[PDB]
């Protein structure tokens, strides 16, 4: 396990690739493993990328990304929910009942 | 425990050359209109060392050398460094600390004695300016 | 031997000598080569009164790192404004930038990473000085000189 | 620089080999030979 | 008098000891006593025994403390001819240390400094330190779970350079200097019965880079991910010989530098080494002036070990092993 | 002139250092290689000497020079020892060989320093010392 | 004239080596010379010393070439009575790829050939590469940070077999077969000094079983996760002695299938071991005819190792360990 940071991102047809730095390596990295959510942020934005080796086989390495830590939501107690990767006032919040959807503008269809 | 007598040794000498510099020293205990004329007196000496080490390096190309000038800029372009004896003796004895390790033998004679013949004058201030400086 | 002669005369000459004894020469007479030179400048930090303070501060600006040339005070000083006289790590004209804005490369808890070059420039910076350069500069020491 | 007084056995290295060479045809010099002795002067003077 | 040794399990004062090897060095954490006793067995009358695996001992040298710390193990052996003897081993008091597994409760120190979770990784077997190098700062400091006493502070001290040994009371020195105290210049042709000297090229190293992470509050990204990185340099090997020795904790810039020079000393102090058999029988930490013109030694070196060995028919000779003069 | 004292002085050493690694099948042949190495470093420090353009490279060269001449005269007359042996009358190859050393398989290495028919060479046999 | 071996420290023809010892193996990627000088001292006149630590060697064999690569250490010993010897150490030049540790900026060779990925593993030190098997393409390289330039190599021609070993000029041979250059027909009671042959039973493996993962460009699933496998045999061993040694880079049916060979062939090497010991002192990859009749040898084997020993009262003796006629 290891944290790297973030450079690009090249999205194949087998999935996402990143292009972590911390040391420059993969200009093509395995992947992002995508538990049902995903992101794109611009090339060089501050995040950490945790490489997941295979085996110790450096070979392969599998990627999770992590949204920018100035940009998560400090969740109240007994929340919790979806956000914007990038903006942590956007949100689709489950709280004691309020399936709550925070922005000015929704679009059905 | 035979002595090695091939050899001399400068420590002792050092140490007691530093209290009796301290003894002497205290540009906060000295009358106010003579206190800039004791610390000029004193970065002027350090100047003299520091033209002593340029003047025996010569062709020395490391880094070292580089960094030594620039620490010895950098000592001497500060105002407040020479007023507390501290500060004066540490810079006074690397100076000459690294004035040896420059060079060995007979290429350090001329420059050490024209440091004796500098340092071989008397105070003209009075009390204890005077022996300050 | 006529030419060793020739030689032996030849070395003791400025203009034609290996650069090691050129320079034992012009040590002789005063003439020394000049070294190198760090950049150098001030720079203008604030943050929360009486945060405290180490002398591993390193300074990024654009793509140089500065350290501290002067002591580094204890704590921060009442007013919240700190201005230090920094120099360049590296050695070289490569440190010198006219720059303003900048940043601090270890994070300090109470002072913000934003600081600011006071003043703007980074003077200072130059190489190490070659042998033809000292030759020529050396030459120009004992050679009669109108105007001088 | 690159230009001093050379070793001694290297100065006589090289006048035996130069005697050798351009006036004795390459034979070797044998010592206690009148070229043994011409060489050995010979070096004393460029030493002195 | 020659007589060196005085040894007491408690009190008693060894009069029988065949042979004795008593061992100091700054490498390790400890040292190493072996007694040699005779211990005769007349099987009709009544014989008694000494189960100590646990009692105690020192090791007076030459009317002075050498030793401090048959802890170690009782060895009695048997033979037809020659045998009947007894060989005790006694470890340094700062043993446990060694063999443990630790038993703090927590498991993670917070805002705490390198002194102080080592006080607290020692003082739970009573093993007062000497620490008399400085205070550095770290904010995270997790303990792997039950690791070793020793291994633990090992890693604490290896990553700000800081001796770990044991002096002749019985406590842990942690030091970054030498002790001082210097002493007896053996010359070639005066006292050593025997020298080997080794300065070898395989142990040695040009540029040593330090990269990390930041351990800090708060800080994360480029400046924790990017930033932290050193290249000192020993200015005395030759050739490129580069490598990268990783750090493990709070990757400062002191701290990278630190790890750094800690490392171009250990591998600077294997790259020239004197052991010396000298006479008769206080040099943990000395430096000496030492005279081998033969190799080519004129200079003041540090004796990294000391060896007292004895044994009543031709011995009583001192093994140092001494530290380069760069 | 730089560019062409370069060319011929590295071409002249490289040259002498061809001629060493390959063995002397005659002295006369040795010492021939070796006159035209010192012919050609003496052409150039004369060159190097002209009106004092260079001193001290004429003096390098003088010092290579001697450098090659006591190699190449050491390699001429002393790599193989060369004698000259007589033999009564011109005699095969493998009786020379055999007389010689005791070893008829070494008949040829006595082709590539004689000239003369394999049937008959001699009355005088260039060979190695015993 | 006997004389085998003139070595040159740069120039310097010992003459006053007392012994010497000098091994070449495929096993490894150097050698290792070892000379004994005299080095006396006279305590009154002046003395002069060689700190090479560094210097370069060679050791032209009975008028050839055998290594090339003072570097190792310096040992100079003493004692009274037979003291002032000078032991000299020297590895193969290629050795930093060995002690050093990789600083190559990138670390992540992306569509190379393990080929390229040696080259430039190696020409950080100046170590003219021989390479002699083939080209091998694979998608991801990434070196462990810093790892060591001599486990990564080995690491990148263990998994398509390449031997990995020095020759005599002084320059890494990566081959795939042997070097040809048969030679003498060594038989029992011609020239064989001493004999061991030593066919063991518990280094054989029946099936090599090899595993792993796809590392390709957009494989995944199944044809990345399940496929890759592969199950080579030694129809020679015997019963069910099954292995599974697993892959770590690229999994193709090939990739396997060498990887598995390359151990079915080191396994195979290591089954019938020959030790020769013959008298006087070209054999690094050489095949000769053996014929030891009594162990049943009558069969063409390659010599693994080659080790000339001297010592001025009895020896000139080479010791050859062979590969085995399966």
């Known amino acids: ?109 | 425990l035979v002595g090695n007598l091939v050899a001399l040794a400068l420590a002792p000498i050092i140490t007691a050359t530093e209290g009796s510099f301290k003894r002497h020293f205290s540009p906060d205990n000295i009358r106010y209109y003579n206190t800039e004329a004791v610390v000029s007196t004193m970065a002027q000496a350090v100047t003299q060392v520091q033209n002593a080490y340029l003047a025996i390096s010569g062709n020395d190309t490391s880094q070292d050398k580089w960094t030594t000038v620039r620490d010895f800029r950098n000592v001497l372009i500060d105002e407040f460094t020479f007023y507390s004896p501290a500060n004066a003796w540490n810079v006074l004895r690397n100076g000459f600390a690294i004035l040896d390790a420059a060079a060995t033998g007979s290429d350090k004679f001329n420059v050490l004695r024209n440091l004796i013949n500098w340092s071989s004058t008397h105070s003209d201030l009075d009390g204890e300016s005077g022996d300050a400086e | 031997f006529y030419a060793f002669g020739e030689q032996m005369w030849r070395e003791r000459d400025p203009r034609f000598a290996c650069c090691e004894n050129l320079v034992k020469m012009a040590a002789e007479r005063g003439v020394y080569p000049k070294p190198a030179q760090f950049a150098q400048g001030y720079v203008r930090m604030t943050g929360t009164p009486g945060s405290a303070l180490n002398q591993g501060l390193r300074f990024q600006f654009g793509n140089q790192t500065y350290e501290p040339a002067s002591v580094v005070p204890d704590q921060l000083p009442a007013t919240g404004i700190l201005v230090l006289r920094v120099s360049a790590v590296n050695p070289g004209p490569s440190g010198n930038a006219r720059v303003t804005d900048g940043t601090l490369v270890t994070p300090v808890p109470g002072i913000s990473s934003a600081v600011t070059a006071y003043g703007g420039n980074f003077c200072g910076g130059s190489d190490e000085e070659e042998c033809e350069q000292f030759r020529t500069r050396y030459l120009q020491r004992l050679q009669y000189q109108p105007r001088f | ?48 | 008098m020659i007589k060196p040794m005085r040894i007491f399990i408690g009190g008693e004062e060894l009069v029988t000891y065949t042979s004795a090897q008593l061992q100091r060095t700054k490498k390790q954490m400890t040292g190493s006593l072996t007694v040699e006793i005779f211990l005769d067995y007349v099987p009709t009358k009544p014989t008694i025994v000494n189960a100590v695996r646990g009692k105690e001992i020192l090791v007076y040298i030459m009317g002075e403390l050498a030793f401090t710390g048959a802890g170690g193990d009782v060895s009695v052996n048997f033979s037809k001819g020659n045998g009947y003897s007894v060989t005790l081993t006694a470890r340094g008091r700062t043993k446990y240390l060694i063999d443990s597994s630790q038993t703090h409760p927590t498991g993670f120190f917070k805002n705490t400094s390198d002194k102080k979770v080592i006080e607290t990784l020692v003082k739970e077997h009573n093993v007062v330190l000497q620490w008399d190098a400085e205070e550095i700062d770290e904010p995270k400091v997790t303990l792997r779970d039950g690791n070793r006493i020793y291994n633990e502070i090992f890693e604490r001290c290896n990553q700000n350079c800081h001796f770990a040994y044991e002096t002749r009371d019985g406590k842990l020195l942690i030091t970054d200097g030498t002790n001082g105290t210097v002493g007896e210049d053996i010359i070639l042709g005066y006292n050593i019965l025997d020298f080997s000297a080794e300065q070898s090229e395989d142990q040695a190293n040009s540029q040593i880079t330090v990269k990390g992470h930041r351990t800090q509050k708060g800080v994360w990204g480029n400046d924790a991910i990017v930033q932290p990185v050193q290249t000192v340099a020993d200015s005395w090997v030759g050739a490129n010989i580069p490598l990268t020795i990783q750090h493990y904790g709070d990757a400062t810039n002191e701290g990278l530098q630190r790890r750094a020079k800690f490392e171009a000393d250990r591998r600077a102090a294997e790259s020239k080494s004197v052991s010396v058999t000298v006479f008769h029988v206080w040099d943990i930490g000395t430096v000496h002036y030492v005279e081998i013109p033969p190799e080519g030694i004129f200079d003041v070196l540090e004796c990294v070990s000391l060896t007292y060995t004895v044994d009543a028919k031709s011995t009583l000779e001192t093994k140092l092993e001494l530290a380069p003069p760069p | ?130």
Not at chain 4, 13 to 34: K, M, Q, Y
Not at chain 6, 25 to 48: K, P, S, W
Request: with cysteine.
């Open chain 1, 1 to 109: 396990f290891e944290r790297h940071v973030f450079k690009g991102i090249e999205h194949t047809d087998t999935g996402a690739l990143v292009s972590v730095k911390g040391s420059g390596t993969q200009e093509e990295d395995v992947p992002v493993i995508n538990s049902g959510y995903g992101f794109t942020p611009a090339a060089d934005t501050e995040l950490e990328v945790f490489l997941h080796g295979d085996g110790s086989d450096a070979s392969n390495k599998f990627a999770t990304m992590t949204i920018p830590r100035n940009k998560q939501r400090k969740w109240p107690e007994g929340a919790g929910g979806v956000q914007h990767p990038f903006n942590a006032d956007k949100f689709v919040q489950f709280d004691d009942d309020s399936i709550w959807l925070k922005d000015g503008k929704f679009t059905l269809g």
């Open chain 6, 1 to 130: 002139n730089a560019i062409f004292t370069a060319v011929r002085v590295l071409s002249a050493a490289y040259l002498a250092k061809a001629y060493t690694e390959t063995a002397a099948t005659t002295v006369n042949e040795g010492l021939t290689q070796y006159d035209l190495i010192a012919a050609v470093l003496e052409q150039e420090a004369q060159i190097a000497k002209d009106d004092c353009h260079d001193n001290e490279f004429f003096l390098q060269i003088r010092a290579f020079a001697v450098d090659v001449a006591r190699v190449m005269v050491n390699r001429a007359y002393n790599s193989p020892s060369l004698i000259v042996y007589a033999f009564p009358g011109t005699v095969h190859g493998l009786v020379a060989a055999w007389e010689i050393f005791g070893d008829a398989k070494r008949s040829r290495d006595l082709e590539a320093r004689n000239n003369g028919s394999p049937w008959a060479v001699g009355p005088k046999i260039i060979s190695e010392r015993v």
């Open chain 4, 1 to 48: 620089c690159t230009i001093q007084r050379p070793d001694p056995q290297d100065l006589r290295n090289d006048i035996a080999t130069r005697f050798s060479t351009n006036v004795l045809g390459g034979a070797p010099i044998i010592p206690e030979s009148n070229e043994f002795y011409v060489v050995s002067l010979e070096y004393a003077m460029q030493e002195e």
